[model samples]
Target: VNSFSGYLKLTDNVYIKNADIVEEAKKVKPTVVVNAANVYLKHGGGVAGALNKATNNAMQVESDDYIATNGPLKVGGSCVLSGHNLAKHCLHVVGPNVNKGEDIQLLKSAYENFNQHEVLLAPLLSAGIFGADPIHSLRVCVDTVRTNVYLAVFDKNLYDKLVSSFL
Candidate 1:
C-alpha cells in the first residue's frame, strides 16, 4: 500500500539521497526513521533533536522501554515510538554518548539492529556526533544491513565520493 520515491542503492541493499528524512517518508508512506538518540533517551541532538520536535516530543514522551543498559542497540535493541507524524514506526537506537571515544562497536551494533526492521536505511550516522567515521561506519553497514540502508546527503556531488569509498 506504500509507494517509495526514487532511491539510489549504494550497496547490495543500502540506499542514498539528499532529501528531508521525514518529508521523504511521507511521499512513500509511514517510514522506518532511525532515532539517533542518547543512551538515556534524552533526545536533543542530531536527528534525534529534530524528531523530538517533529513528534511534538511524543517520541520520548511515550518512552516505555529503556534501551540504556544495552550499551548499543544492535541485533535487536530498539524502542517502538509512534512518530505521530508521517512516520508510523520509529526505529529508536541510542548512539554512544559523545563523551565516549569513537566506539565503532556502537556503530556496528546499530547496523546489525537495522536489519531487524523493514524500511529504508542510511550511513551518515555516528558522523553527526557519535564520532564514528561515516566512511568506516558505512563499511560496517554493508554487511547484513546492506539491503536496508539509505545514505542521505544534501550535497549532490558528495554522492559520487561517498559511493566511491565503498568500491
Candidate 2:
C-alpha cells in the first residue's frame, strides 16, 4: 500500500502536474516555450516527456498551410538528438569546459533571435540530481535571453521572484 499519485494545478489556466502541453500551448499562444527538465540517463526515455507533446503540435503547425512560419524554437542542452525528426530548428548550446564567460555567448545567440519572437523550450537547467540547481541555470538563461521573457518556459518549482527578473 505504499503507492502514491497526485496532481498539482499552478494556475487557473496553467496546471503543473500531469498537464497536457499541446492543449496548454493552444490556450497560451506563447511565442516561446520550455519543456520540463527530465533525467536523461537513468530514465533515458528520450524525448518521451513534455517535449513529445509539444513536438506534435509544432509538427502539425508546420504541416498546415495557414501558418505563416514553421518554427525556430531554441532548445537547451543536447537533448535535440532524442527529439529526432519531431523537432524542427533545434538549437543546442554547449558551454565551454570552463563556465567562465559563457553567459555572453548564450546571451548573444538569444538576442540575435529576440526579434523573431522565439520561444526557449527546454528542461530546467541543471535539473539533473548531480548537476547544478534550477535557479542558477534559469538566471544564466534569462540573462542571455534578455527581453525575451514572453517566450521562456519555467518549471513550477521556480520561484516567482526569480522569474520576475525578466518581467
Candidate 3:
C-alpha cells in the first residue's frame, strides 16, 4: 500500500498518516495548516520552509506582517495569518524548546492553543529541531487536540509503528 495514501485512526476524531504536510495541505479543501513554528514565525527551514516555498513566500510575508503588527508569539502561543494556495489560514504555533529547559506542559499548551479551527492539518510539533521526543510529542498531540486532525508524520517507521498499534 502507498504509505501516504491512507490514514490511521488515532481516537474519535484524530487521524494520522505518513505525508508531507505542505503537499497534503494543498490537496485538501480550505482548512488551517499548523506550522511547527518558532516564536518569531520565520519560515527558514523544515516544515516552515516548505510551507513558505509552496505558498511562494506569501506565507512568510503574512507572518512578517503579523509579527510587525503584534509581537513575536510566545512559547505555547499561536496566531493566525492569511493563507495561500488551497489553505484557508496558517496557524503559527510556537512549541516548547526542550534544550532550553522548557517543560512538556508548554508543549501541551501549544497543542491546546489550537482552538477555533474545526478541521486542521498539523505536524508533530517540537519533535524536530526543538528536540521533543517523537513518542511524547505524538502522545501530547492525541491527548490535547479535541478537533478533527489530519496529522502528517514524515517518518515511515513511526507511521508503521502507529499503524500496527492503532490501525
Candidate 4:
C-alpha cells in the first residue's frame, strides 16, 4: 500500500483545581472566561450568577436585550460576550440541567464549546456532584481540547476526587 508520510498531533497545557471560582477569576484573570448561563441572561444561579456578581452584573447590562434574541440557548450552543473587567471575553455555553434522567452527552457537548482558546476558565459541569460527576466532567473538558484550561471546582472534595481520578 502506498501512503503519504503525514501525522497529526496535539498539545495539552490545561490543569484543574478546586477553588472559589470568583476568587480564581480574580487571580487568573483569564483572557477568556466561560459562563454556564441559561436561556435568559438573568444571572439566576450557579456559575452564571457568580459571574454576574463578580463582574458587577456588567454581563447582564451588556447582554440584556441581546440575549433575548438568543433566548433559550440549546445545550452546548453558546455565544461570546465582552467581559466586564476580569476577562477580555466571556463565553457562555449552556450545560446540562438535571431532568428526570438526562444524557451526559449534553455535558460533553457543552464543554466542547470551550475549545478554541489559549486560556480558559470553565466550571466543573453541574458542580457538587448533583448536576454531573465532577471527575468525568473535567476529563471531558481537558479531552475536548489542547490549551491552558482552568477547570474551576467549587468544592475541595470535588478537586480531590478529580486528583484521585487522574491517579
Against the true structure, whose lDDT is highest? 3
Q: In every candidate, how many clashes are there? A: 9, 5, 0, 0
* Cα lDDT tens digits for candidate 3, 69-93: 9989889989887778847888888
Cα lDDT of model 2 by residue, 1-167, tens digit: 11111323232222222223334444444434433322121121222243444564453332232123433233323323233243333323222212332342333343334334344333334333324444455555554553333222233435443444422
Note the residue pairs that clash in candidate 4.
none
lDDT of each: 0.61, 0.34, 0.80, 0.68
Candidate 1, which segments miss by more than 4 Å at Cα?
A: 64-76, 97-99, 121-123, 154-160
Candidate whose TM-score is highest = 3
In model 3, residue pairs whose N, Cα or C atoms come closer than 3 Å (at least 3 residues apart or on different chains), thus clashing, are none
Models ranked on TM-score: 3, 4, 1, 2
Better of 1 and 2 by lDDT: 1
Candidate ranking (lDDT, best to worst): 3, 4, 1, 2
| Number of the candidate with higher TM-score, 1 or 2 | 1
| Candidate 2 global lDDT | 0.34
Clashing pairs in 1: 13-146, 13-147, 14-146, 15-149, 15-151, 75-113, 121-149, 121-150, 122-150
lDDT of model 3 at residue 121?
83
Q: What is the TM-score of each candidate against the true structure?
A: 0.77, 0.37, 0.89, 0.82
- Candidate 4 C-alpha lDDT tens digits along 1-167: 11101211112555665667677667666778788776565676777887888888788887796766766667667788887776778888776666425567877777777776766876776544237766677667767756666666677775676676663
